[PDB]
Amino acid sequence: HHFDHSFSFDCQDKVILVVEDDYDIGDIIENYLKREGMSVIRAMNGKQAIELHASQPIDLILLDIKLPELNGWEVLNKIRQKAQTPVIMLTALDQDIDKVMALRIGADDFVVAPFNPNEVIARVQAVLRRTQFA
Amino acid sequence: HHHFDHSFSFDCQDKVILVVEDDYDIGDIIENYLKREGMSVIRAMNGKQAIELHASQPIDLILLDIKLPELNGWEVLNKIRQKAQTPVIMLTALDQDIDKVMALRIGADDFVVAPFNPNEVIARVQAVLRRTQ
Numbered sequence: 001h002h003f004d005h006s007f008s009f010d011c012q013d014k015v016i017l018v019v020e021d022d023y024d025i026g027d028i029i030e031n032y033l034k035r036e037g038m039s040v041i042r043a044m045n046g047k048q049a050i051e052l053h054a055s056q057p058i059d060l061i062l063l064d065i066k067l068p069e070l071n072g073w074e075v076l077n078k079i080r081q082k083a084q085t086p087v088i089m090l091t092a093l094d095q096d097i098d099k100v101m102a103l104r105i106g107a108d109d110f111v112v113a114p115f116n117p118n119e120v121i122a123r124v125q126a127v128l129r130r131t132q133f134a
Numbered sequence: 135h136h137h138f139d140h141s142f143s144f145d146c147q148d149k150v151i152l153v154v155e156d157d158y159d160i161g162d163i164i165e166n167y168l169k170r171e172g173m174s175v176i177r178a179m180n181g182k183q184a185i186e187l188h189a190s191q192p193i194d195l196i197l198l199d200i201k202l203p204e205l206n207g208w209e210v211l212n213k214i215r216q217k218a219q220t221p222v223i224m225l226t227a228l229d230q231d232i233d234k235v236m237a238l239r240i241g242a243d244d245f246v247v248a249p250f251n252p253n254e255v256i257a258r259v260q261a262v263l264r265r266t267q
């Protein structure tokens with residue numbers, strides 16, 4: 001190739017808050033993120049997610065749209081009062097896509113389950129790149 | 135309590151989507167869903183058609199297949215970007231396609247992974263159109 005169109009984005013030490021009540025999906029995501037050198041903080045419900053976000057620098061949040069007692073946009077609304085941290089919504093239902101697209105306080109992206117975990121990594125990298133200097 | 139704003143879909147109406155897809159049936163279906171939501175569609179079946187139609191028609195967004203009969207989708211993307219920075223969403227199907235999306239120095243505006251969820255395709259097109267003025 002005579003031209004340089006490709007590269008490897010450096011994610012080392014980026015801190016990802018993974019908010020997911022499903023243990024196995026959360027574990028899969030965590031394992032894939034760590035393979036890229038990212039640091040992972042786990043939250044299994046929204047009140048925990050809000051407290052962990054408030055007490056620590058976070059580069060990106062992967063946020064379940066449906067938690068046991070809060071909807072994802074309720075968590076995002078509270079997080080946004082503390083910081084402009086990028087958020088990718090984890091969805092599953094086509095109705096979830098409608099909700100995300102219509103948010104007044106929007107997410108940076110979404111991903112639709114079931115997913116190849118490599119898709120999640122790609123979307124995390126894309127949002128981290130767009131918000132590198134935000 | 136009101137968390138939503140449903141006007142965002144109306145902003146996509148009449149925007150022009152260049153759908154570059156080598157499978158006639160897949161492109162027919164994608165076109166139908168995009169038109170159902172009020173967008174307009176121009177169809178290209180290979181890279182040469184994509185380059186000609188992009189050069190001559192006002193295009194708001196390109197939906198770009200990776201596997202194409204001559205130039206592949208990555209090579210078409212490079213030829214398109216030599217002339218203009220038109221937003222692009224890649225239609226991917228293999229893990230290796232996801233790797234290549236991640237490696238792009240000038241990122242694709244989005245991508246979607248087969249099998250294609252048609253409501254996800256609609257939503258990602260709308261989201262990129264909104265982000266790119």
Ligand SMILES: [Mg+2]
Pocket residue numbers: 020021022064066
């Ligand atoms: Mg869950």
Ligand SMILES: [Mg+2]
Pocket residue numbers: 112113114115247248249251
């Ligand atoms: Mg999928």
Ligand SMILES: [Mg+2]
Pocket residue numbers: 155156157160199201
């Ligand atoms: Mg195809």
